[PDB]
Amino acid sequence: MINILMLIIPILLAVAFLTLVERKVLGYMQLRKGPNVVGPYGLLQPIADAIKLFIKEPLRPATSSASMFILAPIMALGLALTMWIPLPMPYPLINMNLGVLFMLAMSSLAVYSILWSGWASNSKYALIGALRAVAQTISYEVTLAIILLSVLLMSGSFTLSTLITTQEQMWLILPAWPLAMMWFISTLAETNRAPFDLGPFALFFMAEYANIIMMNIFTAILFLGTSHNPHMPELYTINFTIKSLLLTMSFLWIRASYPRFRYDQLMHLLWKNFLPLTLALCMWHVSLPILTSGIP
Amino acid sequence: XXXXXXXXXXXXXXXXXXXXXXXXXXGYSMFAVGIGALLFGYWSMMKWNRERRRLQIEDFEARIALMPL
């Protein structure tokens, strides 16, 4: 068992090397030059941010309540890194008995990361804004469970390995046309700062940007696939990375192009408008395997 | 001779011109492609699930065939 370390260390580098992508690709959107002075094309800057924040930068806590504040980043980073384990890939590390149920569970527990940070500060000034940030994540998790089930009820069980095999000739974007549009918006609620925005503070960046890649990959399993090929692992590995990278560009697209939707009208897009739409499509997706034979 | 700043207008840069116009999408035509992709989506997907049934029955047949197991 050495492969676990081969899924944390290159992943922590992927969150680090995001700092290039998150302001150079975002840079050309805004007609500005991103990283250039630090490296040949700014490749030395992502690792330079780590030396700046981890070692030299000291701490000044508000109250430091015994166990908390030095426990919230462990829940933030821990839950973000454990999400990589059930991922199907070409081959998964320790494949669970049911796949997507583990995926929804560790994301619903990832709400605590922003909850314990609100309890860390003694002031009332911070906790009202902290609970508002919880409301952005907690509300969209209702619909996230519904849109997941509609894709599953079309084909395959909860296992993530079966979701690759069902996409043999055509993608799941075409049968789930309005549902694919939902996953572009619903994923951005989890601290992406595109439709709505709120030492150890630096550790939250390493956890929040990790979930951004996680939602990009998870959308490329439920809706993308193209080919499987069990005999050739070479063809799948390259083709999967390009599909995930194109979704990473769309995540940074919303951050630059579109203003914030307001907190009150975030509950008018969802609940008032999205929840009647998602359930109507869920009603449609119950009838689909009954109308025409479609059972795994 | 006196030399000062000279006046030039030429094209006048066009005073207030609309650039925003309807492109690609018309209205009713987008629904023909939109719902058309859905109907093509289900028909292609359900044929694969019928091909899955060929594998499904054959998979469970292996358990019935194996009695020394």
Contacts A–B by Cβ distance under 8 A: 41
Question: What is the sign of the dihedral through the CA atoms of A217, A189, A251 and A38?
Answer: negative
> Is A170 in contact with B45 (Cβ distance < 8 A)?
yes
Residue B48: list chain A partners with CB under 8 A: 155, 166, 168-169
State the nearest Cα–Cα gap between A175 and chain B, in angstroms.
4
- Cβ–Cβ < 8 Å for A249, A256: no
d(CA A213, CA A208): 9
Residues of A in contact with B38 (CB under 8 A): 174-175, 177
Give B15 to chain A, closest Cα distance, Å: 27
CB contacts of B54 in chain A (<8 Å) are none
Q: Which residues contact A32 (CB under 8 A, 6 or more apart)?
A: none
Instruction: Give the CA dihedral A41, A45, A47, A49, nearest 10 degrees.
Output: -160
Q: State the Cα–Cα distance between residues A99 and A117, nearest whole angstrom.
A: 30
Angle value at C-alpha A192, between A114 and A226, nearest 5 degrees? 125
**B44 to chain A: nearest residue by CA?**
A170
| A293 in B contact zone (CB under 8 Å) | yes
A271 Ramachandran zone, left/alpha/beta (phi>0; psi -120 to 50): left
- Taking alpha carbons only, the member of A26, A58, A23, A28 closest to residue A38 is A23
Q: Which two tokens stand for residue A280?
A: 């109507």
DSSP assignment of A135-187: HHHHTHHHHHHHHHHHHHHHS--S-SSHHHHT-SSS-TTTTTHHHHHHHHHHG
**SS3 for A199?**
coil
Q: In 3-state terms, what secondary structure has residue A258?
A: coil
Nearest residue in chain B measured CA to CA from A175: B41
Inter-residue contact A243 to A220 (CB < 8 Å) = yes
Whether residues B37 and A174 touch (CB distance < 8 A) is answered with yes
Got the DSSP string for B22-65? --S--SHHHHHHHHHHHHHHHHHHHHHHHHHHHHHHHHHHHHHH
Q: Whole-angstrom Cα distance, residue A120 to residue A76? A: 14
Secondary structure letter of residue B54 according to DSSP: H
Contacts of A285 in chain B (CB under 8 A): none
CB of A162 within 8 Å of a chain B CB? The answer is no
A201 touches chain B (CB under 8 A): no
C-alpha–C-alpha distance, residues A44 and A81, integer Å: 24
**Burial profile A252-274: b = 16 or more Cβ within 10 angstroms, e = fewer:** beebeeeeebeeeebeeebeeeb
Output the six-digit token pair for B39: 């109907």
Q: Is A183 in contact with A223 (CB distance < 8 Å)?
A: yes
Q: Which residues in chain A touch residue B45, judged by CB atoms under 8 angstroms apart?
A: 154-155, 170, 172, 175, 294
Chain B interface includes A129 (CB < 8 A)? no
How far apart (Å, rounded) are the C-alpha atoms in residues B50 and A30? 50
| Contact flag A155-B49 (C-beta cutoff 8 Å) | yes
A contacts of B41 (beta carbons < 8 Å) = 170, 174-177
Residues of B in contact with A155 (CB under 8 A): 45, 48-49
CB atoms within 10 A of CB A45: 19
Whether the CB of A290 is below 8 Å from some CB of chain B: the reply is no
Task: Quickly count: other Cβ atoms within 10 Å of residue A236's Cβ.
Answer: 19
Q: What's the CA dihedral at A122, A126, A132, A135 to 10 degrees?
A: -30
DSSP alpha helix (H) spans, A109-139: 112-120, 124-138
In angstroms, this model's resolution equals 4.3
CB contact under 8 A, B42 and A175: yes
Pick from A175, A292, A293: which is nearest to B38 by CB? Answer: A175
